[PDB]
Amino acid sequence: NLAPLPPHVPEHLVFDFDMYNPSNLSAGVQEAWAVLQESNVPDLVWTRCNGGHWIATRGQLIREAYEDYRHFSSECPFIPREAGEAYDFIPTSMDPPEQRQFRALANQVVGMPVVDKLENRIQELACSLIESLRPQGQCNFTEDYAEPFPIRIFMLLAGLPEEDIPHLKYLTDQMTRPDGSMTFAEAKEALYDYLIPIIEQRRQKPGTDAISIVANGQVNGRPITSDEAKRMCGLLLVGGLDTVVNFLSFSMEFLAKSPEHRQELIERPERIPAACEELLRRFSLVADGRILTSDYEFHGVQLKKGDQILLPQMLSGLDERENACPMHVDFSRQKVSHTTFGHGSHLCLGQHLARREIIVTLKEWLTRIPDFSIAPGAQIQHKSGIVSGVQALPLVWDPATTKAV
Numbered sequence: 001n002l003a004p005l006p007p008h009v010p011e012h013l014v015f016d017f018d019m020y021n022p023s024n025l026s027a028g029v030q031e032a033w034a035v036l037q038e039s040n041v042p043d044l045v046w047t048r049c050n051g052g053h054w055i056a057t058r059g060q061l062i063r064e065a066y067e068d069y070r071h072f073s074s075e076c077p078f079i080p081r082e083a084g085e086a087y088d089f090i091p092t093s094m095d096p097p098e099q100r101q102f103r104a105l106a107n108q109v110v111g112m113p114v115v116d117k118l119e120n121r122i123q124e125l126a127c128s129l130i131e132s133l134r135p136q137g138q139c140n141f142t143e144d145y146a147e148p149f150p151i152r153i154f155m156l157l158a159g160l161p162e163e164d165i166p167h168l169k170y171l172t173d174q175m176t177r178p179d180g181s182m183t184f185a186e187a188k189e190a191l192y193d194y195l196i197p198i199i200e201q202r203r204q205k206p207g208t209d210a211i212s213i214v215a216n217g218q219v220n221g222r223p224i225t226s227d228e229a230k231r232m233c234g235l236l237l238v239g240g241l242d243t244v245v246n247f248l249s250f251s252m253e254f255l256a257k258s259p260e261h262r263q264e265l266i267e268r269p270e271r272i273p274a275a276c277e278e279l280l281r282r283f284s285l286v287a288d289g290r291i292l293t294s295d296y297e298f299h300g301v302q303l304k305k306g307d308q309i310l311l312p313q314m315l316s317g318l319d320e321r322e323n324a325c326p327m328h329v330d331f332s333r334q335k336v337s338h339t340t341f342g343h344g345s346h347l348c349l350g351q352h353l354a355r356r357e358i359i360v361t362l363k364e365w366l367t368r369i370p371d372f373s374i375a376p377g378a379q380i381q382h383k384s385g386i387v388s389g390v391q392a393l394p395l396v397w398d399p400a401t402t403k404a405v
């Protein structure tokens with residue numbers, strides 16, 4: 001359904017893009033969003049979909065807006081407006097200066113030091129999961145690896161029972177790619193309903209898990225509040241359950257379809273880290289935004305206070321103006337430009353954990369299952385939202401071509 005056009009929005013800037021169900025989704029979700037970068041499309045457009053909002057379509061504008069938190073606030077970062085208004089995770093729903101103090105605490109539980117710590121367990125799980133699948137000659141990658149690998153690592157880090165995954169994964173997904181059964185607010189409240197007693201228990205009897213660390217932590221030298229801890233833990237859960245999980249599938253779908261790229265990483269494993277970065281660019285998958293804090297003229301367009309603007313992190317790296325032949329994948333690409341992990345004061349705090357999980361996955365999978373393909377006659381379908389993903393990824397391979405070790 002289309003929302004009536006606001007008085008200040010000119011008809012020539014209207015492009016009814018639906019971030020939750022883009023028109024050309026069948027061509028691939030990144031390709032679907034890339035339609036916003038076709039010749040006849042302005043740098044900044046207005047869509048009447050999902051309540052009505054602006055969309056910056058080029059990396060230059062996306063980066064500029066993420067840098068200017070004075071005009072583009074993170075207070076209401078999600079579309080539709082109801083979701084943006086209910087969204088109160090920390091530090092994401094805050095603008096500097098108040099936002100900053102919380103980043104250090106979050107870094108304590110998902111930062112580099114923690115990643116180096118988890119390395120062995122991460123490697124161990126990747127190898128265990130892949131070796132169990134190897135002899136089968138087939139798998140449903142989304143449920144057999146993409147989900148269990150990153151999620152079990154996060155549940156371990158957070159000290160939560162793996163039996164809780166189905167419930168938590170359902171809630172997380174309603175906040176990024178809602179099925180319609182729950183509003184963002186209802187999903188958020190359910191997630192908080194889950195966390196509240198756990199946070200209280202771990203503030204009473206602290207453990208060494210991420211929730212205990214956050215719940216008993218300090219920010220700028222003072223005690224974090226129970227509510228603040230809840231709002232931060234909610235964000236961590238979403239990050240651990242709906243980011244890398246989706247990215248791994250986009251990456252594996254690509255590798256399954258491109259033997260040449262597979263062979264390259266097999267023959268020259270030292271290129272895996274670079275490959276990871278190029279894949280993060282080509283299969284970028286996040287798209288949230290900001291809300292205008294005041295009337296503001298941006299790139300010749302009059303924006304009004306209260307207007308929401310989607311700033312697709314996904315689009316920056318796909319912009320031909322940032323990377324030549326953007327849809328092409330080259331592991332030797334010189335200057336890989338992208339904003340896959342965000343831009344500005346809210347740069348992703350879990351990017352180190354993410355990269356480690358991606359690299360370990362590429363290395364351990366290609367080592368054991370070097371040759372695999374999309375299952376016969378399968379047509380991979382993608383899904384779009386705040387974080388886009390892959391609905392299903394059936395893969396097949398000849399066990400005789402695999403290596404057990």
Ligand code: HEM
Nearest residue numbers: 091092236239240243244247340341342346348349350354
């Ligand atoms: C492929 C994986 C990932 C991608 C593409 C990604 C992307 C992003 C992006 C684009 C933002 C900025 C949002 C904004 O400015 O509104 C962000 C923030 C954040 N991410 Fe990630 N992320 C990933 C994985 C993770 C993981 C595994 C964690 C750990 C749970 C994590 C924790 C966070 C946190 C705590 C923030 C908030 C930073 C702040 O608001 O100051 N992320 N991420």
Ligand SMILES: CC1(C)[C@@H]2CC[C@@]1(C)C(=O)C2
Nearest residue numbers: 092238239286288386387
């Ligand atoms: C946009 C994000 C990818 C980032 C980490 C999880 C996420 C869904 C948020 O709400 C902030």
Ligand SMILES: [K+]
Nearest residue numbers: 075084085087
């Ligand atoms: K809000």
